[PDB]
Structure 1
Amino acid sequence: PEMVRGQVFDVGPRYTNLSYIGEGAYGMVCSAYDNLNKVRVAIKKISPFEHQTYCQRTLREIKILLRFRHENIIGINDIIRAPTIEQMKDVYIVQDLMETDLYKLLKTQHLSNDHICYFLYQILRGLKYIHSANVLHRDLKPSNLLLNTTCDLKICDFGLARVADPDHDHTGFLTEYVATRWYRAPEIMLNSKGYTKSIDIWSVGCILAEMLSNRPIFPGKHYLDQLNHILGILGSPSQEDLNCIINLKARNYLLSLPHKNKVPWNRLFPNADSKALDLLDKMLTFNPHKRIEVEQALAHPYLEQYYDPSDEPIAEAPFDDLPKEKLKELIFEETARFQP
């Protein structure tokens, strides 16, 4: 097999001339030449089969992406693995080769307002499709937003996605959570399992703020610090928003804090477009019930240049305890369509 950085990267003979390009959850990403389609592609190596949670994440992403088809979601072009379960130790996912991602771009590039607007439009266009399938991405952040050379944007990594379940969203205070800390909505720390669509809108609001200044807006250093950062900018929640938190431990934690005033968005972002800041405010609303929804965000005046509901498609239909052995079997079966 062809080898990359000491590790097998066994994708030939169709895919050759491999170069390291990035990191996925359970393996490296390489670029490669596709000898059939005569183009270079990206390939993610996945080695999940030792760990049950890894196999869960792998299977759920494959299941979702094999159903989804959208311009702003990076699809699965091919899946490579051994012909038998016994011989299958890794799985490789082949996807479009993008030029960069927004994490990399924000490290060194100032975005024009026109770029910010177009990026945000595309994020919300893809998110409209995801949410219309009753799916939550749950880990939106700059490194999951890939860009090609003409700044077309695609959302990556559905390994943390779930079907929305708003009736079962409530939990206790300081409940453990998996998705990336800086993009977590305040309710995650207070009373939410992250099972409603508003979780993703919060993350998009954080991404918009980060595009405006090239700095994460809420860079918390640990679990409860994340809430410190959010409240330091939004200010203390209103009585009405507190009354919506029935859990006593969460409510009383908030009541124990000194009063904090809101920091105006145009003080934080003095060069930003005023319409962008109005939309930012509605995405970074403390109360998730009051937070703007994706279709409302698309219709916001900041996005008027691009908004066109007839060109913002939706999904044709809505979308544990399983030992890794059944899950390896399920991954084998889910990937069978790409074999000869």
Structure 2
Amino acid sequence: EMVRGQVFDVGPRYTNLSYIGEGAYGMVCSAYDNVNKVRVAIKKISPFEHQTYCQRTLREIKILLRFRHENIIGINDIIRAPTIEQMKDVYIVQDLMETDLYKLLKTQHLSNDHICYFLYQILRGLKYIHSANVLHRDLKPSNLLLNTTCDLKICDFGLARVADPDHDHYVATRWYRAPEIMLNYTKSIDIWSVGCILAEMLSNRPIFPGKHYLDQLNHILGILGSPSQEDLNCIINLKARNYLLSLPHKNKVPWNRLFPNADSKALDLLDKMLTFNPHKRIEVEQALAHPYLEQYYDPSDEPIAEAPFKFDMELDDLPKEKLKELIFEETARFQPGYRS
């Protein structure tokens, strides 16, 4: 039960614990499933002190328990105390994945073939997510779990939202953040992130590594060049479209100059994914149909959602006590004596 001066309490089913890269809300550890005769990953989460942590925990649980797809990480089991009073830390059991794209990029330059089929697997899972009317909102290499070159799964659905183009009023990982987010809930923001990931696979480094959001914008415009009047007019929040302007005018740096060693089809697709204007940005079914992925594209082998997702209760304004109860309810199916 003991792991590095801290209780884990995931017995007696899960044993032979071994500490691995710890998460944010608690920690992550490997374990042997005595029931399934295989090693698994267990994610200890203690979100109950703070409201946001409770949103992200509940968000990921509802989404992942409903989703069933080869390129999306699943939830095998949830370990938790019998009563609400007793539980402070939730345990989530998932398939063990050897590494992630972030780690893999630190150690290896990727071949065009490996990049191509990685890109396919991401978009395949994304197709499922978007067909369910769900946004991931935080795609990046570290959220792409890997076992082999043929085994990629998308994880961390804490920031996942149901799509809502008309939702106008916390933010995603900066380097992979779409320009419309920083200037003024659409599927286009996910394609942008993927574009950033594709660029990163092609050169083993972030394409837009800003220090903060204004600098993030400068990096983006530094490659794409100064936005047209067309793209300018779609910036609804003044002090942006009329912030800069002043705009040390920049020319569009050609993709083939940034990535001289890359497949021209990859750069073409990369170009469609990283278009400034979100309304002109390529969609997930179109990206899959792009020539660069023609050797893998197969609509008959790309499952979609049975029913477009909708949160039965809308969580944004609810207190952390109400969240704990909703978390308690959602995880009840994994408890002994569960009815209905």
Displacement of 1:69: 0.3
1:105 paired residue number: 104
| CA–CA distance in structure 1, aligned partners of residues 123 and 158 of structure 2 | 19
The offset of 1:150, in angstroms, is: 4.7
Residue 334 of structure 2 is aligned to residue 338 of structure 1? yes
Helix, strand or coil at the partner of 1:252: coil
Q: Is the 8 A contact 2:183 2:236 kept in 1?
A: no
- Which segment is superposed worse, 90-99 or 15-24? 15-24
CA deviation vs aligned residue, 1:250-299 (integer Å, no higher than 9, x gap): 11123221210011111111110000000000000000000001010000
**Residues 208 and 216, structure 2, Cα contact 8 Å, conserved in 1:** yes
Deviates more, 1:274-283 or 1:78-87: 78-87
Paired residue secondary structure (2:239): helix
Displacement, 1:249? 1.9
- Count of matched residue positions in the alignment of Structure 1 and Structure 2: 330
2:180 equivalent to 1:184: no
Specify whether residues 91 and 124 from structure 1 end up closer, same or farther in structure 2 by C-alpha distance, changes over 3 A only. same
- Measured after TM superposition, the shift of residue 84 of structure 1 is 1.1
TM-superposed CA distance for 1:164, in Å, is 0.6
Q: Does 1:14 align with 2:10?
A: no
Q: Take 2:20 and 2:150, find their aligned partners in 1: how far apart are those partners?
A: 18
- Report if the CA contact (8 A) 1:102-1:143 is conserved: yes
TM-superposed deviation, 1:128: 0.5
Single out whichever of 101-110 and 238-247 deviates more from structure 2. 238-247
Per the TM alignment, residue 169 of structure 1 is displaced from its structure 2 partner at its CA by 4.2
| Kept in 2: contact 1:74–1:96 (CA 8 A) | yes
CA distance in 2, matches of 1:178, 1:8: 32
Bigger shift: 86-95 or 247-256?
247-256
Structure 2: tracts of 5 or more residues without a match: 309-314
**TM-score scaled by length of structure 2:** 0.95
Q: Which residue of 2 aligns with 1:91?
A: 90
SS in 2 for 1:85: coil
CA contact (8 A) 2:202 2:259 kept: yes
1:324 partnered with 2:320: yes
CA contact (8 A) 1:169 1:196 kept: no
Note the C-alpha offset of 1:248. Answer: 2.7
In the TM superposition, what is the alpha-carbon distance from 1:327 to its structure 2 partner?
1.1
Q: Answer whether contact 2:21 2:29 (CA < 8 A) is retained.
A: yes
Q: Structure 1 residue 25: deviation in Å?
A: 2.9
1:287 aligns with 2:287: no
Post-superposition offset of 1:243: 1.9
For 1:313 and 1:57, the matched residues in 2 are separated by: 26
User: Structure 1's 294 and 34: CA in aligned 2 closer, same or farther, altered over 3 A?
Assistant: same
Distance change in 2, residues 1:99/1:222 (3 Å): same
Per-residue CA shift, 1:112-165, capped at 9, x if unaligned? 111000000000000011011111000000000001135310000000100111
Q: Is the 8 A contact 2:114 2:149 kept in 1?
A: no
Alpha-carbon separation, structure 2, partners of 1:210 and 1:204: 10
Secondary structure of residue in 2 paired with 1:253: coil
Q: Which moved more, 1:321-330 or 1:69-78?
A: 321-330
Q: Structure 1 stretches (4+) deviating beyond 6 angstroms? A: none
Structure 1's 169 and 280: CA in aligned 2 closer, same or farther, altered over 3 A?
Answer: farther
> How many Å separate the matches in 2 of 1:151 and 1:298?
17
Pick which of 315-324 and 161-170 moved more: 315-324
Distance 1:16 1:329 in 2: 29
- Per the normalisation by structure 1, the TM-score is 0.95
Contact kept, 8 Å, 2:74 with 2:94, in 1: the verdict is yes
Task: State the partner residue of 1:173.
Answer: none
* Cα RMSD (Å): 1.3
Distance 1:313 1:169 in 2: 31
Between stretches 158-167 and 237-246, larger displacement belongs to 237-246
Q: Distance in 2 between matches of 1:141 and 1:311?
A: 25
Confirm or deny: 8 A CA contact 2:3 2:17 kept in the other structure.
yes
Partner SS for 1:249 = coil
Aligned 8 A contact 1:98 1:149 in 2: no
What is the SS of the residue equivalent to 2:127?
helix
Q: How far is the alpha carbon of 1:24 from its aligned partner?
A: 2.4
Question: What percentage of residue pairs aligned between the two structures are identical?
Answer: 99
| Cα displacement string for residues 56-106 of structure 1 (whole angstroms, at most 9, x for unaligned residues) | 111111011110000000000000011111111110100000111000000
Q: Is the 8 A contact 1:135 1:164 kept in 2?
A: yes
User: 1:125 matched to which residue of 2?
Assistant: 124
